[PDB]
Amino acid sequence: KRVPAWHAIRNVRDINIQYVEPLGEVLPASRKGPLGDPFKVNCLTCHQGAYKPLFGVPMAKDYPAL
Amino acid sequence: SDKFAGMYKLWTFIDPRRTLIFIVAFQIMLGILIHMIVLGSDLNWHNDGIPRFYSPRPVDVAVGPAGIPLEIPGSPMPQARNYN
Ligand code: BCL
Ligand SMILES: COC(C)(C)CCC/C(C)=C/C=C/C(C)=C/C=C/C(C)=C/C=C/C=C(C)/C=C/C=C(C)/C=C/C=C(\C)CCCC(C)(C)OC
Ligand code: HEM
Ligand SMILES: [Ca+2]
Ligand SMILES: [Ca+2]
């Protein structure tokens, strides 16, 4: 289980550097913090206290848009 | 030869009570030890399955491409293993 976590780190950096932080131009002042940056993603943003998000039910295969 | 004829005199400076106690205790200790050493071996006779096995036999679990058991897709706890 150490080897997926190693990739997870890199993955999260991608989500925050390429996508979520550049959205700080579009969102209103409601979605920002004290220092003026938007909300970002953690390990807890999808696991939410479980060893796999939603215990690992494979939802994404049914939708060819994703 | 006749050189051992005076060995009984041993008991005039070595006493019977302590000697008997030591001997008996040591023999029981040795008995238990040798039975346990032979049990922990290939010569084990309780678990050999001769003349027949009496308890159910172990069943292996299939592994994944990472060499550990597969996770079950809605279990609220991960799966156990004993080897890492
Ligand atoms: C499958 C059977 C097991 C075995 C299972 C047990 C168990 C279980 C016990 C013993 C016990 C004894 N065993 Mg045994 N024993 C084995 C093999 C041996 C061998 C050997 C050379 O292979 C020897 C020397 C012994 C010796 C002994 C004694 C130390 C001890 C007897 C009590 C005592 O106070 O002894 C003093 C007496 C002597 C030292 C003389 C006895 C030696 C005997 C006759 C061994 C001869 C065997 C050997 C093949 C002879 C080769 C010579 C010639 C070619 C014929 N065993 C094999 C591996 N043995 C018992 C014990 O510790 O009680 C307190 C005990 O509970
Ligand atoms: C009243 O009567 C009087 C008193 C006057 C007369 C009495 C007469 C009588 C009854 C006398 C009786 C006399 C008796 C019974 C005498 C018995 C004598 C015996 C049996 C002596 C045996 C001696 C054995 C010896 C000294 C062996 C020594 C072995 C040594 C030191 C080995 C060392 C080995 C090493 C260190 C190797 C290590 C190996 C390894 C690999 C495990 O180490 C890491
Ligand atoms: C840095 C934080 C993260 C860590 C340390 C992390 C760690 C892990 C680990 C170790 C696993 C494998 C679980 C297992 O097999 O027992 C896993 C699975 C998973 N994670 Fe993450 N994760 C993180 C962030 C995320 C994020 C943000 C998401 C959502 C975008 C996510 C989605 C998933 C999914 C869907 C799986 C299941 C994949 C599978 O079935 O093998 N993780 N994560
Ligand atoms: Ca990318
Ligand atoms: Ca048997």
From TrEMBL, chain A:
Residues given in the record as heme b 2 binding sites: 31
Post-translational modification comment from the UniProt entry: Binds 4 heme groups per subunit.
Residues that, per the record, bind heme 4: 43, 46-47
UniProt-annotated binding residues for heme b 4: 6, 10
Binding site for Ca(2+): 14, 18
Residues where heme b 3 binds: 1, 47, 52
Function: The reaction center of purple bacteria contains a tightly bound cytochrome molecule which re-reduces the photo oxidized primary electron donor.
Protein name: Photosynthetic reaction center cytochrome c subunit
The organism of origin for this protein: Thiorhodovibrio frisius
From TrEMBL, chain B:
Positions bound to Ca(2+): 45, 48, 50
Domain Antenna complex alpha/beta subunit: 7-46
SUPFAM superfamilies recorded: Light-harvesting complex subunits (SSF56918)
Gene3D superfamilies: Light-harvesting complex (4.10.220.20)
Keyword Transmembrane helix attached: yes
UniProt subcellular location: Cell membrane
Protein's UniProt name: Alpha subunit 2 of light-harvesting 1 complex
Protein's organism: Thiorhodovibrio frisius
